Design an enzyme around this catalytic site. Structure first.
Site, PDB file in Angstrom:
ATOM      1  N   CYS A 183       0.808  -1.210   0.000  1.00 53.07           N
ATOM      2  CA  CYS A 183       0.000   0.000   0.000  1.00 53.07           C
ATOM      3  C   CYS A 183       0.845   1.266   0.000  1.00 53.07           C
ATOM      4  CB  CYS A 183      -0.934   0.006   1.210  1.00 53.07           C
ATOM      5  SG  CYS A 183      -2.090  -1.378   1.261  1.00 53.07           S
ATOM      6  N   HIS A 236      -8.884   4.258   1.944  1.00 50.12           N
ATOM      7  CA  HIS A 236      -7.642   3.591   1.567  1.00 50.12           C
ATOM      8  C   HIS A 236      -7.713   3.188   0.103  1.00 50.12           C
ATOM      9  CE1 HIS A 236      -3.861   1.500   2.169  1.00 50.12           C
ATOM     10  NE2 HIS A 236      -4.378   0.437   1.580  1.00 50.12           N
ATOM     11  N   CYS A 280       2.422   1.917   7.635  1.00 51.63           N
ATOM     12  CA  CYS A 280       2.598   0.475   7.648  1.00 51.63           C
ATOM     13  C   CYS A 280       2.248  -0.110   6.282  1.00 51.63           C
ATOM     14  CB  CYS A 280       1.735  -0.152   8.743  1.00 51.63           C
ATOM     15  SG  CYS A 280      -0.012  -0.303   8.304  1.00 51.63           S
TER      16      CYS A 280
END
Lengths: 710, 436, 436
Positions: free
Chosen positions: C99, C392, C422
């Site tokens: 991500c 997201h 993260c």
């Protein structure tokens, strides 16, 4: 602090009591009599406070929740009264624990066995972590024993009868995941919130209001309990040969508990300790366990260990793959193998592949991790990259010149810190070393037929061997899940030296017109599981035969087998299962049952005579020859300690554990008492049954090889 | 320094190149059938690491790649490090460059060691022509989206009502340029028609590449670089390439139907390299680290070069574009260039490149250069052959030539290597190597 | 000693961020439905070029990564430039890192202009949850392999024999770790049980970010870098982020059942980033050329940091690991920070990270540093809301934080920006920005 014991009461802000079990001594949370006493005092101070609403029980130990009953007090029992009393004091406490109305919860982490599940069945609710260390069970039948209280009666109706009986009989190991779906543990909760997850479970209104029903409720009652009992008993005696007590006893104590109520089992299981706990089988099993545990604690040598994280194997095939398998699957150490032909590499990698993926095939594992140990499986045909192997181990043919040449060149092709080891067939390690630049780092291991079943190894240091080399080697088997035994570098050694009379007599007897099935069934009835000839062929006829000339050249003619009959089978392509034909039928066309031997071996043997010798007579002769060799081998102290010698035979050869072992048998059979009847056998057949002088020494004057305490 | 740029690190150490290992290449049916691209990467990395004395905790970064991508595990680099024994804190990544992902990583790996964050790297990749993942029909992709987001059962049957036609028939794989539709042989053919390459002019390059490569197998020179493959069946190991056919005469495969045009297709399947299967891994790490742990690198590095051109005609002439730029960025010339290498992706499409390299007109105007980049000799050209023999895995042939040349320069005892390779999308890969 | 990585070129010019723009985001099955992620690539950059008026030929490299890759476009980077008006000779490519591909692009591209081979770059990406390239069962793909290689017509029907009624069922998408099987919410969940994260504080953060992010939209600060997207049917443009629920209360959050562990979990849809789609495009290029063509950079670059940690337990602790190392390389401190940001993937892992950034004992054994990172002040932490608001969109999450902070530190004094994030596979991304 000698008064605090282990059970410490702790009251939080809420109306629940959190209980921690902190044994001040050993790291395990074991059971002593005083714990049962003070906890009654502890529960007394808990009973006076009406404000509480629940209780939760904590391991207070990362090692285990509660280990269980300590065997030493069982060894301290003198007669039926003490054995009954410990069960009785266990009942009233566990009854008192079960008598409280508030919610009782126990949090399980680490180990919970024997006396561990004693308290677990005394709690309405229970939680065990998903950490893979936790385990539940009753490892009591192994010792020729049974749980102290409650186990035979309150576990069966909480979880079922079929699961309870096999757990008490088979004594397997139970995981948290399979305990949950079975229903014993109400929930599996994370170890982080293990204490807190039981907090609201203690706050649950129902101690037990809707117990789980039974899907197998069909046979609940007297209609099928006996049908189950008769079939399990018939299999038991067929499996146990009748020489193990506490097997049919389990059927009795459970039956009386199930049929006429709870109170009957209380006295019945109290009475069971009265006879079963004081039984030569029980003492033999208790003594061997202490013998087995001590050598695991025993570090073999004294020198500090050395770094060991890379191992080099020189030779593949099947034994190379098997030894790599355990060091990979269990030990998980990087390994390198060199073979001049990739076919050995290809087969050995297949070989490990064969034993693997069966656990995966059993759906207890997945291929995701399976490939991981495939990675550490490293194979090559060169010396390159071998410079950082901590240990180098030889798995090539036992030609001494071939062994000496490779050990000479491997030093030049490996680090000096590397220690060399070899699983020699008969060549001495010092003789193998010879022109050794680092003989002190040259040592000898000894393995057997596929040792995934066999948990034993032999330590064979030669004249020049640094104690670090032994210390490093010894600690290997511990991390290999094996027992270390240090033996002297002598021809025939210990296990092989005493196994030869076991099979030589079997070969000698059967040629005199005795059927194998009758001697085999009686021998496995006696206490040697699996008979001689089947053991003889599958382990390798030649490899058992190969040591015989070495044994014959070592001590005397006694090890000799009858000539031209044992060798005739070898040069006949009748070389056991490895050759597909030998002794027992190997087609296995009889529905995979206990096929009778090939109906052509008998004409090949002279087999003149009849049974003649009695069924126990061959059994007592078979044990004596190894016993005659057992005292003989230890006479020159081939074994470091007597306990090492006892543990070596019973788990390496198969002496009846209920008899305890070779010298357990000797002292049980009146010490030197057996000598005379043994000497009579020497008169019956020949001086092959001559008494050992030390055996004569201890026998004539009257002695036990174990001063110890009795 | 108007054209040459330094390739030395901040601290004064050259970008040393250390040896590598090659998985032998096999056809999509003879071997490597059904074996995924993951374990091939696992297979090469574990043994190459555990063949010298190099540890696994020292490595800090590495990249593999695959032109054929399996949808499962989008970041292939994660799986290689986790299973095969390396530090669980290693910087693994995956990049994409059709037919030259090896060289793509080489620039990507070198730039990482250029920054000083990482002191050592591992380069390689995997390519397989027998585990091609099959996608569904595009229509039977939107329909499955709605049903997961659907709420009631009645809506589903309404959604299924539009399923018709041959949507059950999946989509077979395709390779031609998606926005151009050129199959890399049809545009390879037009070059021969554009630049005058005869099937008699070629089909001896196919022979000479099958030769000088089977001889390398016969000479066994490529021994320590080619692995002996093992399989979970374990039926038997593989030692030699089976695609290579350095035994048929050049006059045998000239009587073959043209691969692409089938009308005047001066190229066929025989003189065009077939896709083969394999993997590789190479050690790339700085000069100072090689000495401070006591390791000689398999030669060294000089420079790198890549070019992009419009995808409408003769797209595989990137090496013709790329060749002078590498030499100027190294301040070098073909005269001071012992041995060269070409990817030779097809019959022709490189005969033009050497012709273009020797053609003054191309470098004069198409590049703006005052002169041509110079001609090259066949003897120092693909001495170990090229793709027309062993085969052509897309992303793997890059590092494979790196292995062949450096040891060949080790056989030649020094000198400067050079490899040229054409890539999809009008891309060319070229660089000057150095075996010290 | 000082382990600092100066981010200045060979000539000493520091790496500069000049500008960027963000495509607005929408939930899955919204206006952003059925749109290919490659199309977002053209749209985000094409208008950015025109708005910037920077020449399309001066750019010499650009890399957009993407989560939810589609096999129809293997090298998406080539397609965008072949789709957009930038020069076909740009030598671009694509990468993939969880991500944080935006930050992955930030790393490997900033070093690209460190090399001197180029001078300018473009950063961005595009991922959309409304589009999934789903395929059939794996063996069914394997079945189709043989039929293309089959030669006998009668052999095919024998090959068709192996089938089942459930075979035509396709494989649904998955998000849990392939070698672990733990969904990202599960690992965030186990931390809530590991360290203790109440739902009330997790839901409060969802409220705060919603209140903060909506206020930024109400303040209209995120307007000059947020696109006005048009959907090819051309019904009505999208102006604001519909994901944000700025009219919400903590009580509404608490009535949601936990999604993953429906037993005692403390995370719901309320405190979890939803599936959002969009794109991004940001311009990175060295400061010297910015003045050479006369442009002021929207801030600058200071340092970068990325860490690999365990996935089995506490996989989202990358920001906990990466925090001191970045300030080490920058020679700075958490105190020396005007504003701090972290990717609010889960409110549970959010409270976990900042608590671990403040956990001194964490740095004593896991890191071994001299001191722990420091105390993260909530006022400067995610001032414009966080990921629990905007959502997201996977890849663009990294750049979208880059956008707000540089504007925000432009909205304030120069300061020094910092973002932490993260990523899957035990990966964490951290860096210190300058923003003058």
């Amino acid at each position: 602090m000698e008064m605090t014991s282990a059970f410490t009461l702790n009251v939080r802000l809420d109306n629940i009591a959190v209980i921690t079990i902190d044994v001040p001594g050993e790291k395990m949370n074991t059971l002593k009599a005083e714990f049962a006493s003070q906890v009654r005092a502890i529960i007394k101070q808990l009973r006076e406070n009406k404000e509480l609403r629940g209780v939760v029980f904590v391991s207070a130990k990362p090692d285990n929740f509660i280990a269980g009953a300590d065997i030493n007090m069982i060894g301290n029992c003198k007669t039926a009264q003490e054995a009954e009393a410990l069960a009785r004091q266990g009942q009233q406490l566990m009854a008192e624990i079960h008598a409280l109305p508030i919610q009782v919860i126990a949090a399980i982490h680490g180990a919970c066995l024997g006396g561990g599940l004693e308290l677990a069945l005394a709690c309405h609710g229970r939680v065990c972590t998903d950490d893979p260390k936790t385990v539940l069970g009753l490892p009591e039948v192994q010792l020729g024993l049974l749980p102290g209280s409650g186990g035979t009666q309150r576990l069966p109706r909480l979880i079922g009868v079929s699961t309870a009986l096999e757990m008490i009989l088979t004594g397997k190991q139970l995981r948290a995941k399979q305990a949950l779906k079975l229903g014993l543990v109400d929930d599996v909760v994370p170890h982080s919130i293990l204490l807190e997850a039981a907090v609201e479970l203690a706050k649950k209104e129902r101690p037990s209001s809707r117990p789980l029903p039974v899907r197998e409720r069909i046979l609940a009652g007297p209609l099928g309990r006996a049908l189950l009992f008769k079939m399990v008993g018939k299999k038991t005696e067929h499996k146990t040969q009748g020489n193990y007590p506490a097997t049919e006893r389990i059927l009795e104590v459970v039956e009386t508990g199930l049929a006429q109520g709870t109170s009957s089992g209380y006295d019945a299981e109290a009475r069971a300790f009265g006879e079963l706990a004081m039984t030569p089988q029980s003492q033999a099993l208790r003594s061997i366990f202490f013998a087995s545990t001590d050598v695991k604690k025993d570090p073999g040598s004294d020198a500090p260990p050395a770094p060991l994280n890379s191992v080099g194997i020189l030779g593949g095939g099947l034994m190379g793959g098997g030894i790599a398998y355990v060091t990979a699957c269990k030990a998980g150490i990087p390994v390198r193998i060199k073979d001049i032909n990739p076919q050995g590499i290809n087969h050995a990698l297949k070989y490990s592949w064969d034993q693997l993926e069966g656990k995966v095939r059993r759906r207890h594992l997945k291929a995701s991790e399976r490939d991981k140990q495939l990675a550490l499986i490293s194979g090559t045909t060169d010396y390159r990259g071998f410079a950082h192997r901590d240990l180098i181990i030889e798995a090539v043919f036992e030609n001494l010149e071939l062994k000496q040449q490779m050990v000479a060149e491997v030093e030049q092709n490996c680090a000096a810190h590397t220690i060399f080891a070899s699983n020699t067939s008969s060549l001495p390690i010092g003789d193998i070393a010879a022109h050794a630049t680092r003989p002190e780092q040259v040592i000898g291991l000894h393995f057997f037929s596929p040792v995934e079943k066999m948990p034993l190894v032999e330590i064979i240091p030669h004249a020049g061997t640094s104690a670090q080399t032994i210390a490093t080697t010894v600690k290997l088997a511990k991390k290999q899940g094996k027992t270390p035994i240090v033996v002297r570098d002598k021809a025939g050694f210990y296990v092989n030296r005493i196994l030869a009379p076991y099979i030589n007599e079997a070969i000698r007897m059967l040629t005199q017109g005795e059927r194998v099935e009758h001697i085999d069934a009686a021998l496995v009835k006696f206490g040697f599981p699996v008979g001689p000839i089947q053991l003889l062929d599958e382990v390798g006829i030649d490899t058992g035969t190969k040591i015989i000339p070495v044994l014959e050249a070592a001590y005397g003619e006694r090890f000799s087998a009858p000539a031209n009959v044992v060798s005739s089978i070898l040069n006949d392509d009748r070389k056991g299962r490895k050759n597909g034909r030998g002794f027992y039928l190997y087609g296995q066309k009889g529905r995979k049952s206990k096929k009778q031997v090939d109906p052509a071996i008998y004409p090949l043997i002279g087999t003149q005579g009849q049974g003649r010798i009695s069924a126990p007579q061959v059994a007592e002769r078979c044990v004596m020859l190894m016993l005659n060799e057992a005292v003989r081998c230890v006479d020159e102290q081939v074994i470091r300690s007597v306990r090492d010698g006892d543990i070596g035979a019973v788990f390496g050869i198969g002496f009846p554990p209920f008899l305890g072992g070779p010298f357990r048998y000797i002292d049980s059979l009146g010490a030197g008492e057996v000598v005379a009847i043994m000497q009579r056998l020497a008169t019956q057949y020949g001086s092959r049954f001559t008494p050992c002088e030390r055996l004569v020494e201890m026998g004539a004057r009257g002695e036990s090889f174990w001063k110890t305490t009795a | 320094m108007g054209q040459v740029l330094p390739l030395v690190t901040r601290q004064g150490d050259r970008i040393a190149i250390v040896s590598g290992l090659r998985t032998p290449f096999a056809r999509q049916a003879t071997a490597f059938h059904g074996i995924p691209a993951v374990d091939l990467g696992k297979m090469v990395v574990g043994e190459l690491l555990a063949r010298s004395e190099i540890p696994a905790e020292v490595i800090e970064q590495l990249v593999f790649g695959q032109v054929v991508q399996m949808p499962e595990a989008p970041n292939i680099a994660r799986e290689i490090v986790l299973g095969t024994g390396m530090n669980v804190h290693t910087d693994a990544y995956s990049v994409s460059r059709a037919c030259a992902t090896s060289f793509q990583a080489v620039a990507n790996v070198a730039e990482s060691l250029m920054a000083g964050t990482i002191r050592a790297g591992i380069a390689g990749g995997a390519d397989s022509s027998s585990v091609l993942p099959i996608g569904v029909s595009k229509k039977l992709a939107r329909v499955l989206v709605d049903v997961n987001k659907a709420r009631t059962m009645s809506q589903r049957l309404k959604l299924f009502s539009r399923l018709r036609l041959r949507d059950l028939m999946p989509v077979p794989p395709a390779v031609a340029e998606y926005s151009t539709g050129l199959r890399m042989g049809d545009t390879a053919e037009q070059m021969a028609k554009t630049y005058g390459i005869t099937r008699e002019q070629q089909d001896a390059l196919a022979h000479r590449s099958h030769q000088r490569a089977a001889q390398a197998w016969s000479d066994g020179k490529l021994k320590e670089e080619v692995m002996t493959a093992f399989i979970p069946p374990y039926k038997q190991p593989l030692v030699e390439d089976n695609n290579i056919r350095g035994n048929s005469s050049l006059a045998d495969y000239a009587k073959l139907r043209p691969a692409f045009d089938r009308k005047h297709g001066t190229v066929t399947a025989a003189n065009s390299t077939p896709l083969t299967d394999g993997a590789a891994a190479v050690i790339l790490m700085t000069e100072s680290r090689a000495k401070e742990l006591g390791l000689v690198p398999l030669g060294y590095l000089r420079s790198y070069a890549f070019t992009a051109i419009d995808v409408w005609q003769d797209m595989l002439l990137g090496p013709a574009w790329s060749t002078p730029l590498a030499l100027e960025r190294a301040g070098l010339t073909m005269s001071d260039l012992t041995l060269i290498d070409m990817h030779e992706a097809f019959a022709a499409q490189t005969l033009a490149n050497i012709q273009l390299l020797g053609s003054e007109r191309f470098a004069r105007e198409a590049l703006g250069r005052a002169h041509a980049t110079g001609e090259v000799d066949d003897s120092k050209f693909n001495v170990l052959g090229g793709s027309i023999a062993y085969g052509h895995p897309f992303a793997a042939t890059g590092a494979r030539m790196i292995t062949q040349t450096l040891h060949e320069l080790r056989r030649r005892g020094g000198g400067f290597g050079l490899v040229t390779a054409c890539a999809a999308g009008g891309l060319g890969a070229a660089m000057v190597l150095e075996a010290e």
